[PDB]
Symmetry: D2
Subunit: 455 residues, 4 copies
């Protein structure tokens, strides 16, 4: 009866993406807001800006509010939100309540300083930044790196296996299966590196970004330095100093754009794998409800759909998050509640990709037969050699010779024997030893050396 859920995220695919609810769910949002509030009061206590330090034990009681958050804690916040119709204000009340309800006298004194000087977005943006960072570092990017590792394994394992290339869908100079996978490794590797280099930013600046309240409360405090310390020490966050009521969200747009480019590469992979399978060059480990031996690339297909959905959210984010009327409009708040959904679609797709990739094997006989039926792809190296030995208009010579004939091995090798005999005999012999399977350039070297040679 998670089966009665409308979103396939919380419905059909909940098993695939459930680990995300610790980062993104209203429960996790409430939890992290409580933590941010508690950490702020702990920092005010540390700094003694407004009161003398509470007792060592009162500090641990203050801590425990943030380190032991229960389901009932969450229900309590929701209960209060029914009164307030303000979700962050409900958390202030909750934290003050737990302080009132504590034994401690010093804690009863300092409870009025909960949320002191803050605006709601001070709490929210840190909650989101810490959840997003931890989600990507602990769940989403590791899943991407698993796909990357499997592509590298495939690149090395099949580095030598000749494969007929297709440009415009049609036969072209050979590659190897390893090399084609190496190409996807190299791109995913680059995408992961760009994404990991985006800095997750936060701010803590009050009503409109200017420390208005803070300046009145404590005129000799350098609030820019004090907040930078707060965010670094309590959250390991970079501080984006310039903001209105909202953090600008540009780092979210950067991350999402990065993930969206990764997703594009993965869609490219999914469709190529589908096409290799269509052409019977790859086989899948055991399907069709009517044909007993038919096995379909349904993991790649499911992945392709969910990568497109993830990218829809990601385009929405980068398009709408950067704009907010004056010192803010609230339309960004609901949009941001869908960051979790966007990364769920990524995770569903990435896990399907992994499942698909682990099912594939090469079909050597089919790979070989295709290559041996596509001798026309040897046109270029014959011309290249002819030209190296001063032949003029090599392509026209081959064109003339093959005119009105169906090009095959016999014709290509007759062309070498009777039209290239002017070459040194060792060069002629090497032309005669070339096959579409052996004309693969440095595909094998490049495939097995991709870890080292990719930028």
């Amino acid at each position: 009866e998670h089966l009665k859920n409308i979103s396939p995220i919380d419905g059909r695919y909940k098993k695939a993406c459930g680990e995300l609810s610790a980062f993104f769910s209203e429960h996790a949002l409430i939890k992290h807001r409580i933590i941010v509030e508690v950490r702020w009061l702990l920092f005010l206590n540390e700094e003694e800006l407004f009161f003398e330090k509470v007792t060592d034990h009162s500090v641990e009681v203050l801590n425990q509010i943030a380190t032991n958050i229960t389901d009932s804690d969450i229900a309590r916040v929701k209960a209060i939100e029914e009164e307030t119709n303000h979700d962050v204000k409900a958390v202030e009340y909750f934290v003050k309540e737990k302080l009132k309800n504590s034994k401690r006298e010093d804690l009863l004194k300092i409870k009025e300083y909960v949320h002191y000087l803050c605006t709601s977005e001070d709490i929210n943006n840190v909650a989101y930044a810490t959840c997003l960072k931890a989600c990507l570092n602990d769940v989403v990017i590791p899943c991407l790196e698993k796909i990357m590792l499997k592509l590298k394994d495939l690149a090395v394992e099949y580095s030598h296996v000749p494969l007929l290339s297709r440009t415009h869908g049609q036969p072209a100079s050979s590659t190897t299966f390893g090399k084609e996978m190496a190409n996807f490794y190299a791109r995913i590797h680059h995408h992961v590196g760009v994404i990991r280099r985006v800095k997750v930013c936060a701010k803590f600046n009050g009503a409109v970004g200017n420390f208005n309240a803070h300046k009145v409360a404590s005129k000799d405090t350098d609030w820019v330095n004090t907040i930078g310390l707060f965010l670094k020490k309590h959250f390991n966050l970079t501080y984006s100093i310039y903001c209105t009521q909202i953090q600008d969200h540009d780092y979210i747009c950067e991350l999402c754009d990065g993930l969206a480019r990764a997703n594009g590469t993965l869609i490219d992979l999914c469709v190529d794998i589908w096409l290799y399978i269509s052409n019977n060059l790859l086989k899948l480990k055991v399907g069709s409800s009517t044909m007993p031996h038919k096995v379909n690339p349904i993991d790649f297909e499911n992945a392709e759909g969910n990568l497109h959905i993830a990218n829809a959210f990601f385009k929405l984010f980068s398009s709408k998050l950067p704009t907010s009327r004056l010192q803010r409009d609230l339309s960004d708040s609901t949009v941001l509640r869908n960051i979790g959904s966007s990364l769920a679609y990524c995770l569903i797709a990435y896990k399907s990709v992994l499942k698909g990739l682990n099912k594939i094997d090469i079909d050597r006989r089919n790979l070989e037969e295709e290559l041996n039926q596509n001798w026309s792809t040897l046109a270029e190296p014959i011309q290249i050699v002819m030209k190296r030995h001063n032949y003029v208009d090599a392509y026209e010579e081959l064109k003339q010779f093959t005119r009105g004939k169906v090009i095959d091995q016999k014709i290509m090798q007759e062309f070498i024997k009777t039209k290239c005999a002017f070459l040194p005999q060792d060069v002629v012999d090497q032309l005669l030893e070339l096959t579409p399977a052996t004309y693969t350039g440095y595909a094998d070297y490049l495939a097995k050396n991709v870890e080292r040679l990719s930028g």
Copy 2:
């Protein structure tokens, strides 16, 4: 506990969109697939194409597999699916086992005909078609029609209330608040009419759309006509004859495009109401300021309409393409139709909540109009021209050079520069104010239902 859900659809906003799960959830899809399977067998029984009509009571027993589907039945399908890793197959197995266990001879006889001649998409597309049609007809469009009704109520109630227009954000010829709401009514009315006219289509054509199986099974049956009947009689659906393994989905794209255009109009409305409120011209029925009331319903709507539209653009771009006789990437995409409509419903309910908080601020409306006498420049020029004056604009410009234009200056222009006019015309110009220069705004606002057209 729904608080641990990742999607805001099933978490924070569950209350606002929960009525959608009867149409769109895996439970709803399972339920409707079972119904399609049962009705196909009922139809084969009616038609006697492959066996003689079963007993009257056996057709009652068959129908009850469809008319009493429980959470238990749903969990059973899911259980079978762990084995099959094929969802529709798991429904075939389920209907068969209900038939095996029925304690009816003639039903044991016909159970091998469950899903006879069908492909899974025959079942899926009818299930989606009926769910989407019912959802729009019963939940989604009536919610849009409630916004329409409120906009028309606002248009009538405030038809006569003058409002300083703004073009490029700056003062322009007056309108009325009711008229500005009538504009949105006329557009939503048009959109709803377009959406209602989209024909919901379905197919039931076997593996690849060609009745391959059907033709072998019963070579003298006119299957085009038989399926037309099946779809109309059992589901009240329009038959789209041409298909591959999949129904083309073009009608879904059309409905989605239509919804997205209505959403764009509603975004236009949300931002304008926000601007009127910002300019203190409307009032509404803040954690720091004691008397501050913010347009948070309209802001929430605005955000959720953008989200619905992201899905809608996705559907319209990806649904139309499928590799050859189909690739399966559409299956997972279609599972998001309910989410897209949940964003709509959340947004529409926020609009309704916001519109019901609206009141005019008459004093601020009047004060603004009374400080924007420069907007009477055009009617003064219009009337000068009517009485054969040449370059009326340059004359007014000449007169106001270096002056800050206000009431005194504009009425001085009329009295001293327009005195050549008939005195009755002079007198009418001198009675004009920005609040009375509203053209047929009041007329158009009151008559919008009657004049908005199709």
Copy 3:
């Protein structure tokens, strides 16, 4: 040196789309604005709202301003626009000038009534509506209907030609080449009908949509009825009564969405044709710069790109045109100047599709060999017949029999002979006459009857 143009529309592809400049170019916009201004004054003359009718000859002199618009007329408008920095105001001045510069005394009287009561958007929206309507009716939809006719011709011509279907890329029950093309006909036919049914709307309502000026000028005139007459009589346009300073643009969004769905179907076509060619089932009329007999589906590929570009504009339009702050912001004006570009990308793509489709022929031998190597697709009709004669678990019987075997003709027909012998012998004989080429259902009937049977 149209080759120095930045847009490929006015550069590389100008030959393909040049007929559009009569509808959409700054030249055409100026031209149609002049016509709208002249027609308004003609209507004021007809109606005698503000002056007694000019002389019969003065009417023809007034007409000739709109029916003889030259390149120098256009340069003159631009010259004036350098002064005004207002493009419509420059047209008012131009029309007044031509009236001043006319002989006529009555025309010298009425020239002050040029643009009388109008706002600039009154002129613009009618200019755009008439250009858009005429462009779609005369150029864009006829090109689409040409593709539709070619698909119908292909559907009928090849209605009988058996073709191995592929679902998930893999073998499935047969169809015919005609039938697959018939499917595209049926969708394009539906799209064209939806698009032709959108009503092109216009308005003519002054500053803010309310007839403010008009009501003061002529209090007893029913302006709603008078404008409806003006738009019908002078332009054959539907009147959208409700507007601000701008016509709402919703009909443009409807048309563009319609074209975008058509484009999606055509992208589906382009990729399917590419895949049939990849699989050597279709051949192209005569390529590769290195392989002498290679001919690539470059027309389909070029079409696929330009359909995506057209759809980018179309998504932009439906997303941004519906919103405009209060009684308008001007950001819609520049957006609308790209309607022409959007339809140029459509026309480039549609002409490439036509060029590609006229190059295709079937490759019967390849079509036949593939079918005859895919006997596994006969699994379903064997099971269907077994079941009709009371066999239980037919699929499992076939599965058991083929276990560990490579399914081929011999195995499938041995299954019929030795596992289906319980069937009436006439049914057994019909099973034994079935081939993948003859198992095509009613594909042939449906393909040749698509004109009549499509909805």
Copy 4:
């Protein structure tokens, strides 16, 4: 006559973006392809991989094919293309015929090596890479940097000018005009830094990316290292080793995404300036009203930034996918990179034109602040709390119940409800006004270049 062009890029806005045609037009692409071909042959000559170094003067003659390309040369390539229907092939033919006609023996000898070992995309991708890099470095980014400079000039000049903030469109704690411009400066500075750090990549790897031809032609050459050298020495480009027939285009997507994020920030700015102007707080340096001046530069920018972003979203979604070792659908898409940057340039030039019309309206700024004393609710509560007051919000709410909050009421609250405060603190509260309650807005605005970070 350019007035007959369909695209506004080459029609109405030709003047604003014409400098782009040197980077992006078919003429520019033809020109750069010729240059790549010539430099490859020059490189084979330097390396002596297939023939001995030609004569000193023959290398001068070869280089001049590249350094003096004319309109005539371009028309010649086009002429050849009518025959070939292959654009790069037409360039091979052109360079060869320049060589055949050169009147040099050693050049007649080596002309068969034009395009040796290459695929057309070897030539195309280097041509695009160099054009895109130069365009961004020389035209596009410097135009963004001019907006940055102006925003910083505004931030400094108006650092101290108080401005009533608006959250949800309604009064909030003050800021300053310079501070609100500093916010945009900091974001554009960040975006420009990201865009500048994208590495422009190229390849030169033959038919399918594997040096198939190269390996057969010269089996002992380290081609990975040789091409690295070619690309760095002749074009100053980074080598992306891994490719199919096509370069992957990922770096184009990254640049485009970066530009699109800068565009979103500039859209945010255009709408905010429009809102400030609407609220009469800024003034600018109408066919009907004689004194009306509209923000048409910002409105034009807003529209063209949406257009640039439509292309950018297109590129990022379609460029990354290519069927197998490539499909040709990317070719026609890449021809639109120049158009996308022309929309950017048009928009950036409109922003610059608008920002240069800006002045503050001090009286209207001051008057608004002086009518919004309710915004001092927070600092009053903050200070009460600091001196141990409990539920300060409820106290102020209690006091203002049923009252329209104004200066008199707020100062009465301080004098009668906050009198328990130290008198110096009371005195400071009584000296606060909404115009002086601006926190560190002035400080942050003046220090933005120094504090915006990377």
